[PDB]
């Protein structure tokens, strides 16, 4: 579209290159997106609260527009989170008295939601994040204490995957999570999917969120996670990749642009990462960035409200950053 090669095309024989999108960027960044991405994920417009605000009311307008945009351009679409403890309306977990919904209610409601959401795009979504972030970060805790686990039951994951698989048996069903490289959590995610496959659950892939930063995880840590998850004979997708220039609970806030140090480390960081992905392209079939360009990122408001970040290879003006050129695939 100017002087830079299509990022997605440079990986056409390696793995998809995708981005998290929102309908608001389609009428302005649609061309840029179609040029550089052969996959898209709705950042939020396909989550439970966004498509099923009320029990008897579905609002698919936004998600439908994203799908029409992609499908008409040969662009793949990943469905994000059907079951997650966040961005899920309260009515789903409540009964008529405002009390907690029963197991039977949870099941019938989850069934209807899945059939409607997954069934709507039957054969159009190549991959669905069936369950998102079910494992704890606490060293001594395996399963995250959520309303799905409490009101539906310990088999809520098996339930979710089975219902989604019936709504569309051709879509790849993924289990998505973050801090997937941390040794302790890695083994928990590994044992989860492992146990699921053993139960006969239709889980075909593990989603490595990739919410990393210019300081970690290291190459070796990512390498072990890759090989570990891959050994399960499932596909691996990097679903929400971003490299924050800030660390956890970062105290810095006077930055209008990355420092020279940040820019240098991020550039080298992206190079090493995609170098690693190419090495494992046999296991990785899709790599999605949680955003299009630095002009917008969910990180600008999380975990610090109003703190600008620049975690992508494209800058605020949609121009390729130095990291872009170091990430161009070999096809
Ligand atoms: O849907 C994605 C989601 O999967 C992602 N998880 C990453 C993540 C998970 C937990 C987390 O931890 C906290 C959550 C709330 C409050 C404090 C910490 C921080 C990031 C975030 C972006 C969303 O668009």
UniProtKB/Swiss-Prot annotation:
<comment type="similarity">
    <text>Belongs to the glycosyl hydrolase 10 (cellulase F) family. Cytoplasmic xylanase subfamily.</text>
</comment>
<dbReference type="InterPro" id="IPR017853">
    <property type="entry name" value="Glycoside_hydrolase_SF"/>
</dbReference>
<protein>
    <recommendedName>
        <fullName>Endo-1,4-beta-xylanase B</fullName>
        <ecNumber>3.2.1.8</ecNumber>
    </recommendedName>
</protein>
<feature type="active site" description="Proton donor">
    <location>
        <position position="133"/>
    </location>
</feature>
<dbReference type="InterPro" id="IPR001000">
    <property type="entry name" value="GH10_dom"/>
</dbReference>
<dbReference type="Pfam" id="PF00331">
    <property type="entry name" value="Glyco_hydro_10"/>
</dbReference>
<dbReference type="InterPro" id="IPR044846">
    <property type="entry name" value="GH10"/>
</dbReference>
<keyword id="KW-0378">Hydrolase</keyword>
<feature type="active site" description="Nucleophile">
    <location>
        <position position="240"/>
    </location>
</feature>
<comment type="function">
    <text>Plays a role in plant xylan biodegradation, probably via the hydrolysis of short xylooligosaccharides resulting from extracellular xylan hydrolysis, once they have been transported inside cells. Shows similar activity on xylans of different rate of arabinose or methylglucuronic substitution. Also displays high activity on aryl-xylosides. Is active on xylotetraose and xylotriose, but does not hydrolyze xylobiose, indicating that XynB is a xylanase and not a beta-xylosidase.</text>
</comment>
<comment type="pathway">
    <text>Glycan degradation; xylan degradation.</text>
</comment>
<feature type="domain" description="GH10">
    <location>
        <begin position="1"/>
        <end position="330"/>
    </location>
</feature>
<keyword id="KW-0963">Cytoplasm</keyword>
<dbReference type="GO" id="GO:0031176">
    <property type="term" value="F:endo-1,4-beta-xylanase activity"/>
</dbReference>
<dbReference type="GO" id="GO:0045493">
    <property type="term" value="P:xylan catabolic process"/>
</dbReference>
<keyword id="KW-0119">Carbohydrate metabolism</keyword>
<dbReference type="GO" id="GO:0005737">
    <property type="term" value="C:cytoplasm"/>
</dbReference>
<keyword id="KW-0624">Polysaccharide degradation</keyword>
<keyword id="KW-0326">Glycosidase</keyword>
<keyword id="KW-0858">Xylan degradation</keyword>
């Amino acid at each position: 579209s100017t002087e830079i090669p299509s990022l997605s095309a440079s990986y056409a024989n390696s793995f998809k290159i995708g981005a998290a999108v929102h309908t608001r960027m389609l009428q302005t960044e649609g061309e840029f997106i179609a040029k550089h991405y052969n996959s898209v994920t709705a950042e939020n417009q396909m989550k439970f609260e966004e498509v099923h605000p009320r029990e008897h009311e579905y609002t698919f307008e936004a998600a439908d527009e994203i799908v029409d945009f992609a499908v008409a351009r040969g662009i793949g679409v990943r469905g994000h989170t059907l079951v997650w403890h966040n961005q899920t309306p309260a009515w789903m977990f409540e009964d008529a008295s405002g009390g907690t919904a029963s197991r039977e209610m949870m099941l019938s409601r989850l069934k209807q939601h899945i059939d409607t959401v997954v069934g709507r795009y039957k054969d159009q979504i190549y991959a669905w994040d069936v369950v998102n972030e079910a494992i704890e970060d606490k060293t001594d805790l395996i399963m995250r204490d959520t309303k799905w686990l409490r009101l539906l039951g310990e088999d809520y994951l098996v339930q979710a995957f089975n219902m989604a698989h019936e709504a569309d048996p051709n879509a790849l069903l993924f289990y998505n999570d973050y801090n997937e490289t941390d040794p302790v959590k890695r083994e928990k995610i590994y044992n989860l999917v492992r146990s699921l496959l053993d139960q006969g659950a239709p889980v075909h892939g593990i989603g490595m969120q990739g919410h990393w930063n210019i300081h970690g995880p290291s190459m070796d840590e990512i390498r072990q996670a890759i090989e570990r998850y891959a050994s399960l004979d499932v596909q691996l997708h990097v679903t929400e990749l971003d490299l924050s220039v800030f660390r956890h609970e970062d105290q810095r806030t006077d930055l209008t642009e990355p420092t020279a140090e940040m820019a240098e480390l991020q550039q080298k960081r992206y190079e090493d990462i995609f170098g690693l992905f190419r090495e494992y392209r046999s296991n990785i079939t899709s790599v999605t960035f949680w955003g299009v360009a630095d002009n917008y990122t969910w990180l600008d408001n999380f975990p610090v409200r109003g703190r600008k970040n620049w975690p992508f290879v494209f800058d605020t003006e949609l121009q390729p950053k130095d990291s872009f050129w170091r990430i161009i695939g070999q096809d």
